[PDB]
Write a protein that binds this DNA or RNA. Sequence first.
RNA 1: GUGGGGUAACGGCCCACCAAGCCGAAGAUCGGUACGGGCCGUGAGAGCGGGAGCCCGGAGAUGGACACUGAGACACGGGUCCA
RNA 2: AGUGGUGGCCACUAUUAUUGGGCCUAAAGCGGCCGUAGCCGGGCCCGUAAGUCCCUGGCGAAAUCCCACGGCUCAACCGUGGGGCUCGCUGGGGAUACUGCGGGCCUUGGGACCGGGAGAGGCCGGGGGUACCCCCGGGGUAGGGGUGAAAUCCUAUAAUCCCGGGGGGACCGCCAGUGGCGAAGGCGCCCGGCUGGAACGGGUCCGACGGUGAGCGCGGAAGGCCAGGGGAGCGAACCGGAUUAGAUACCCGGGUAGUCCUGGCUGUAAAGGAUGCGGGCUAGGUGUCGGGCGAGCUUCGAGCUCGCCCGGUGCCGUAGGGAAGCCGUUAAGCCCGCCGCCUGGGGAGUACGGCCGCAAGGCUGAAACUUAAAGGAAUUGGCGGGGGAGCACUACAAGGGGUGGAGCGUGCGGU
RNA 3: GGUCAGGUCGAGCCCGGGCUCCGUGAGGGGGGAGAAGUCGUAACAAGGUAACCGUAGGGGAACCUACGGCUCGAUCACCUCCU
RNA 4: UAACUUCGGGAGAAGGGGUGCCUGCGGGUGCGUAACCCGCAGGUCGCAGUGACUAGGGGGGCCCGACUGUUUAAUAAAAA
Lengths: 129, 145, 78, 158, 24
Amino acid sequence: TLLDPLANALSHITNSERVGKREVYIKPASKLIGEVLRVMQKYGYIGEFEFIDDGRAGVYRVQLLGRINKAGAIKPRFPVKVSEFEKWEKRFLPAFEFGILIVSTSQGVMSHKEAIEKGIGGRLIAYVY
Amino acid sequence: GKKAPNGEFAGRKLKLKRKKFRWSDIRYKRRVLRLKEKSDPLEGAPQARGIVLEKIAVEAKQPNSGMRKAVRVQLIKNGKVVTAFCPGDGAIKFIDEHDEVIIEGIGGPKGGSMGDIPGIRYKVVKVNRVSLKELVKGRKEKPRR
Amino acid sequence: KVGSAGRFGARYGLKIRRRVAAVEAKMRQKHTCPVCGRKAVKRISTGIWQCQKCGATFAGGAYLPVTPAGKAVRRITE
Amino acid sequence: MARMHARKRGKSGSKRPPRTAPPIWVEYTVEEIENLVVKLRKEGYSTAMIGTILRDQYGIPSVKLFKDPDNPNRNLTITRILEKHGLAPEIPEDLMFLIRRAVNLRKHLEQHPKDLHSMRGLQLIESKIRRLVKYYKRKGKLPKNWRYDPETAKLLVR
Amino acid sequence: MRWKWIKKRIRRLKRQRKKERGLI
RNA sequence: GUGGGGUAACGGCCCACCAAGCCGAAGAUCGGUACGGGCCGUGAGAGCGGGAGCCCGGAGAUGGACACUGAGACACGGGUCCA
RNA sequence: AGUGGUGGCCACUAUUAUUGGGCCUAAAGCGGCCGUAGCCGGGCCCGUAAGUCCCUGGCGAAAUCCCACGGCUCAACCGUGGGGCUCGCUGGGGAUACUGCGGGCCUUGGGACCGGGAGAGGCCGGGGGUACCCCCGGGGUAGGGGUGAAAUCCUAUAAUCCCGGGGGGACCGCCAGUGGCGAAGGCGCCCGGCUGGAACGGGUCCGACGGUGAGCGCGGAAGGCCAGGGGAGCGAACCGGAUUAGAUACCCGGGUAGUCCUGGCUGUAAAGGAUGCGGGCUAGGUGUCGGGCGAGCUUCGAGCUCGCCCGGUGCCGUAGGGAAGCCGUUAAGCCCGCCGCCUGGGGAGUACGGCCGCAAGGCUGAAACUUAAAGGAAUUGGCGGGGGAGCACUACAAGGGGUGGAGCGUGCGGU
RNA sequence: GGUCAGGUCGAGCCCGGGCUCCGUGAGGGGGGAGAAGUCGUAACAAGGUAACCGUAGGGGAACCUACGGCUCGAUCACCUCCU
RNA sequence: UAACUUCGGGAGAAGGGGUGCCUGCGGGUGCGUAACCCGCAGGUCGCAGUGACUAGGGGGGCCCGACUGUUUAAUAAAAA
């Protein structure tokens, strides 16, 4: 069935971009999607985004800049401490200064640099570059 | 995936998968058991002395040629039969029967051997506790016996 | 494991006593009585089977109240 | 959609009505339409067949979209109304029909013997009923002390 | 080839079970 | 479970009575191997491998059994006894 | 003041894959399903704060380890200070995105409802013809049969041949299509009843009931095993004949179990798409089957066709992937959850034990020893009683002479 | 300290069974090596009999035939794909 | 309680332990303590408690016939 929906929503977004399509229609539809979209949009790695509110199936329509090369989620969703944020960013990711290791904290979704500033992590949700 | 227990508390499943498949290496299974120890006649030791039962020679295989000088030994260490390859140039003068001969492994326990030998895994370093290898060389001690 | 052969012992030869054990077991059973709809049908005698409930006596096989020979006569139609 | 469980092909592409704005092309009230449901249930119709009727005759889009809510039970439509009246048993209509089929099959296999295809189908229907029931007993759609075994099935049917 | 291996094994087994049956 | 003995003392430790429980696939039970730890060896790490001098705690003193004196031994150069 | 050897361990070895490996063809998908334990869960809210993050404080002996400085000529080392130590345990305060749980809620997943429709899905009964065979009668002589050639063989009160009749078993050429149905193994004469499943349009119904699934359970071609019946043709074994040196074989004449049916039993496959299952997502084009829908044509019947739409089977091909061949909405593409499985070759799918089976077998499943290769794809070449095409007179045919006979001449082997 | 009655701790010896490992025995089976001997010509091209496979019987051996499957199948193998 | 097994059996395998008498209780049947049956505890004697009488020694391998039965009334009861 449909399980782990978020990974899937990121995965569609990667295929779109590999093709170099203008936009994406996300069939999955959550608070999680929209807060993650807001984080993406502050960095300006995505463009403008629309949420239509339907209760048949909410849709998000996303503009692609093409600045996200790959974005996917974590297989265990294993937890991450504050000291440990760097360890996961070098280890897995090619990034070093791109500043998104997206993590969920008690406030919503944060990036890497944003997690340091607050001082709070949680469970590691995903990554973006 | 195409496979795995990736869940949070699934990890015991994954850990067992790996544990069974690790046994598929012979070299891992041998060493943990003591099968290595038991099988080799020196008993996991670098060398053992024994008495030369008789001088036999062994035939070369099909690629190759050459009739190799050899000793069949009975270890004084245990009470087992070993086949041990004796080098030497004109080898047989240096080597001597019914004296005490000391045998070592060679080349690891890879199980393989050279081509000139049908299956000999062993070396004779020493005869009466003075090396054969000194007698091969002209620069330490020139032929004796 | 025995179905009912274990009275005999180890004796008579395995195959024959295995067969007898099955066939008799089946023979003892209740079977359809299209008479009353109540059943308790037992073998009274050779080729005779009778239902306890209705008092009805009728002809049967050696292990069933109906015979496979008899069904062929039915099947051919007038 | 698409899932596979006794077919090697996908599911149908049908969807619910999206006229999620209340009717106004209907010209009957909520009141008249309830009235109809009591009479039809009483007649001998089962609750799926009533709702189909309501869509054709009385012209509503969905029966989820002209009568939700009006009683405070989840997913308010027909059988919840009936349930408060006592015109519907607690065992969902879904389950009543599944169970009815599961009885029907033992009786054919007997008379028609040597049915491989029909026999596999008897295993398959039954199996599905235990899994549905296991969730229902908990939910309170069924009693906690209820069990689904095939003898209890035959009881309900008769 | 393929036939060989299997029948040889089946012979190997039937001789062994013969040598098991008549020396117990 | 209940009562009791005995111990420095809790305790099916031992005992009488009363009950039929207790344990198990997240691996019981059985066979087999092994002093454990700080650490050490290796490896960028993850990990692998190891328990040696040395320090820490337990165990032993030809094999087994046994008591006495002492806060402390069932006693490593003490006794009794059996092999 | 060591160098070198052997033995072992760790790195090299993503050859144990968490970092950091795979399963069309290299080793590797379970014949398929079912559903248990276990793992994993759509959207929206709410309670708890168990998981999860933060802070303080108790503590994780010394030594070992790093950094610093000092002492011993120097350094190793040791002192001293600082930092860190297997670091697995404890208590309180806070946060609530994410997860767990309890409650409420929603149709998006799942199951369920209704109507037209197709089908070699299953069970039963009836029935037709073609062709073979047997027997009866007629007709009609000398060979038939068989093969690459043969032979065995068969035939004279008559076989083969040709007609008419009756009986019997078995199966369904055409139909038949790159076609249709079923979970899978698989399923084809025609008619009727009984019965299972599916695509689809209309979501009418329950409201997260979901996904996966170790174990367990179940089906399982052919042949085999057991009983009974049936037996026309076919044909392991078998008995001749040929071929062949001999045939052990291809070939031919006879021929038994069996093939057929029912009851019962066992369980294997290159049981293949060598491609585990469920979902989302990622260029298209064309054909085809069935459904929905709007038309044109119309024999007025969806008969012939087009497009949109829904599902399935095919061909060509993008992004991408792959060692390459290929694959490409039917993925070997991009992701996630779970199961099954592999880690060089031979020994060996053996031994031993247990377990199942009536047997045959099945399941599980080693070690000593030995080896520098085993394997996969493609490139090029040679080759092939492999296919297609074509030339040659140092080829073959046609034609003319000659050698091998004899004697001699000459050379060689031998002597 | 004597001797003895009652109770407890209680080795050592003996007897039988269970479990687990090691050594070893006529005779027998296959395996890896050897150089030379012996028979056939099976497989690899289609190897002059395309091959594999499950099952069943038989063969001196490589093997053969029956049935069903499969092509990783020979071939211009031409309802058709191939042609 | 072993080899073996047609799962019935082998089996009373093999091998170990208790058993008298007196004194006080319990369960079971009954009927009102009458009539009975089956256990428990304490005391206690001998060389010995089934003390007499009664009363199987056990185990394996090989051959044959499967078995139970029958045979030379009256030398032969068997592998017939």
